[PDB]
C-alpha cells in the first residue's frame, strides 16, 4: 500500500505533502549527486565537495531481488 495521505483541499496541504512525504533534501542525500553536479565538480580548477559525498543508499543484502517485491518465473523451474 502507499501511506495514508490527507485529503485537505488547500494548496498549502499539497505543498506540505510534497515537502514532507517526498522532501527532496533526504532524497538527494540518499541517492547521490546529479551528473551535472558531477561535471561541475570534476572539470573545475579546484577540488570542491558534494553534499551527498557518495551514494548513501545501503547495499541491498539479496542480489537477485533488491528493494522490491516483483519476482518472475525461474528458467530453473
Amino acid at each position: 500500500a502507499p501511506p495514508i495521505e490527507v485529503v485537505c483541499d488547500s494548496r498549502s496541504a499539497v505543498i506540505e505533502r510534497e515537502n514532507i512525504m517526498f522532501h527532496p533534501a533526504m532524497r538527494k542525500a540518499l541517492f547521490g549527486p546529479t551528473p551535472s553536479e558531477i561535471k561541475e565538480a570534476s572539470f573545475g580548477p579546484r577540488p570542491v565537495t558534494l553534499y551527498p559525498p557518495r551514494a548513501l543508499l545501503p547495499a541491498p543484502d539479496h542480489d537477485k531481488q533488491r528493494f522490491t517485491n516483483i519476482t518472475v518465473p525461474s528458467m530453473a523451474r
Binding site: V6, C8, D9, S10, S12, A13, A25, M26, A29, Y51, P52, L56
Partner: protein
C-alpha cells in the same frame, strides 16, 4: 478541513490565529536554549556544565548543528 490541517489546528504552523507558534519557536529554539553558542560560552570555565566541551573533538558550531537537526541530517553530516 482546511481549518485544522492548514490554518490554526496545527500547533507548529505560525499562521494568524496560531499566534503562539512564532514566539514559542523563537524563544524555545534560539533565545532560551542551552545549546546556542552564547549560552554555552558563559558556562565553560570550571565546575559548570559545559566544562567537557573543550576536550571532545567538537566546536560550538558542531554542537549547535548537532542539537537541532534530526537523526537523519546528523547522519549525513
Amino acid at each position: 478541513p482546511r481549518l485544522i490541517w492548514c490554518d490554526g489546528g496545527r500547533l507548529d504552523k505560525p499562521g494568524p490565529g496560531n499566534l503562539v507558534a512564532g514566539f514559542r519557536s523563537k524563544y524555545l529554539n534560539h533565545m532560551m536554549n542551552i545549546w546556542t553558542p552564547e549560552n554555552i560560552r558563559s558556562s565553560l570555565e570550571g565546575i559548570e556544565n559545559f566544562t567537557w566541551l573543550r576536550f571532545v573533538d567538537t566546536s560550538l558550531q558542531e554542537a549547535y548543528r548537532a542539537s537541532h537537526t534530526d537523526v537523519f541530517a546528523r547522519a549525513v553530516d
